[PDB]
Design a protein around this nucleic acid. Sequence first.
DNA 1: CCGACGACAGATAATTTGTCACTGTACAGTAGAATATAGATGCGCATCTATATAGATGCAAATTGAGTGGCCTTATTAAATGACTTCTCAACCAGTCA
Length: 56
Amino acid sequence: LEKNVIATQLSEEAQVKLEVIQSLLEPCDRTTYGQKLREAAEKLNVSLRTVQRLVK
DNA sequence: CCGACGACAGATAATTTGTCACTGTACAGTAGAATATAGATGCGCATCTATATAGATGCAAATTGAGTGGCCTTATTAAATGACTTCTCAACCAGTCA
């Protein structure tokens, strides 16, 4: 048996979250995760735990 | 010391429900009805049939009247009755007598 889901055209908030996810797609260093997660919290204006929930 | 995940609490749009204002649309005589078909049922009229003959005919006893055929002692006499046949049926003159 088979299953899949595909996103339609993204909303503007989902576009911003796509740029944040792309900003968090590159790194390999724990220091750089901490830096880019905190800048992403500032870019989204959310808590650091909120950005962690978004990545998850 | 740094990073990731769970508990608890807090804030938030999606969902559902309710209320309110503006609006497209039906009310305007109208689809029960027309037109085929098959299939079964019933009344009428004809077309046979099977029974029922009484009249006519042929025949065979059953007398019935009307025929026809076959079988029989005889000769004399006498009487009686009834018949037949034959024959016959003159008239005056001549010789006695009381």
